[PDB]
């Protein structure tokens, strides 16, 4: 286990949504992802976005310090985001294998 005060690096490998992101009773969205890599433990990049060019964060990531905990292939983790009203994208990962899911939050 890592020592006190050490952050993990960002996960470098690919993620996939294991199932459709699901809206909670009060309008947040829960996500489960599976991770192809063996560089874990590592930090899961996760945000909402409205512009896929700037990737400027909108809404909020609720999960504090989302991580892949396992060093073994195909492990899973869950996180929760708070989308803006209207349309946005759930964006998991950074780099050439980032995944997106279009989301709509009603009033």
């Amino acid at each position, epitope marked *: 286990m890592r020592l006190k005060g050490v952050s993990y690096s960002l996960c470098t490998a690919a993620f996939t949504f294991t199932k459709i992101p699901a809206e909670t009773l009060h309008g947040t969205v829960t996500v489960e992802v599976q991770y192809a890599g063996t560089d874990g433990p590592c930090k899961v990049p996760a945000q909402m976005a409205v512009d896929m060019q700037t990737l400027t964060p909108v809404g909020r990531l609720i999960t504090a310090n989302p991580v892949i905990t396992e060093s073994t292939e195909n492990s899973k983790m869950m996180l929760e985001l708070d989308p803006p009203f209207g349309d946005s994208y759930i964006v998991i990962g950074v780099g*050439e294998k980032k995944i997106t899911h279009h989301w709509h939050r009603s009033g």
Partner: antibody, heavy 116, light 108 residues
Framework: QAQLQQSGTGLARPGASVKLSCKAS????????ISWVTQRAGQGLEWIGVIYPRSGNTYYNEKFRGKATLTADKSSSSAYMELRGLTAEDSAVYFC?????????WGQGTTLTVSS | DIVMTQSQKFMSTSVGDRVSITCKASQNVGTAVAWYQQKPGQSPKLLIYSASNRYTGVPDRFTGSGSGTDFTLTISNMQSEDLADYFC?????????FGGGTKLEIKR
């Protein structure tokens, strides 16, 4: 830049074993798996199996159990596939590929012809 | 093991056509599907990953869609350089099986 370089014997007699090599560079070998894929002439791709060099864990397509044995050497970032008991039906192109839920990086392929 | 079925092994298309390539999984694979194109003598090249994400450098003519068991690669405004073999592949569980391939050829 991630690269996979393949090598191996191209011509074998029935009954022979051949060890194919896949030399990785330009990325961290222990962060991803390496799979092997075969393609008969004019036919489709078939996934043989994968090794994850970080642990040595392997997973095989049952159709290739025993026919193919996957190994890896962390010290040199090399993966190997030993094809045993070759028959004419094993004549094919064999690729290695990095595993990442959609292989971007592939070896160039080795063409194996098995004939008496 | 999961079977990925590409029922159309050969498709004839004209430049400019909307090309639809279908891949059917024998059980639910979520969005864990990639699409590749391959030209003779070369390794396959990744086009789409996790069902609907276009890989960098791939022309925007290529779009993947679908989830569950039914997946589609659409090539809008098909160009002659798009003539190739196309394969889907699933990553839901081992073995990471490929579809049987669809070979795109040109009409005259």
């Amino acid at each position: 830049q991630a690269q996979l370089q393949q090598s191996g014997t191209g011509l074998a007699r029935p009954g022979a074993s051949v060890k194919l090599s896949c030399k990785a560079s330009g990325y961290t070998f222990t962060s991803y798996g390496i799979s092997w894929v075969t393609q008969r002439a004019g036919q489709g791709l078939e996934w043989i199996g994968v090794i994850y060099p970080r642990s040595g864990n392997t997973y095989y397509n049952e159709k290739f159990r025993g026919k193919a044995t996957l190994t890896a050497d962390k010290s040199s970032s090399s993966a190997y596939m030993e094809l045993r008991g070759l028959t004419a039906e094993d004549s094919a192109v064999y690729f290695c590929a990095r595993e990442n839920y959609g292989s971007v990086y592939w070896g160039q392929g080795t063409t194996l012809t098995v004939s008496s | 093991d999961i079977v990925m079925t590409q029922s159309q092994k050969f498709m004839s298309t004209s430049v400019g056509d909307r090309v639809s390539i279908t891949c059917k999984a024998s059980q639910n694979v979520g969005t864990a599907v990639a699409w590749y194109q391959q030209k003779p003598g070369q390794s396959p090249k990744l086009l789409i990953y996790s069902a609907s994400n276009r890989y960098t450098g791939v022309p925007d003519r290529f779009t993947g869609s679908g989830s569950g068991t039914d997946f589609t690669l659409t090539i809008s405004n098909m160009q002659s350089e798009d003539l190739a073999d196309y394969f889907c592949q699933q990553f839901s569980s081992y073995p990471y099986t490929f579809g049987g391939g669809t070979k795109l050829e040109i009409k005259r």
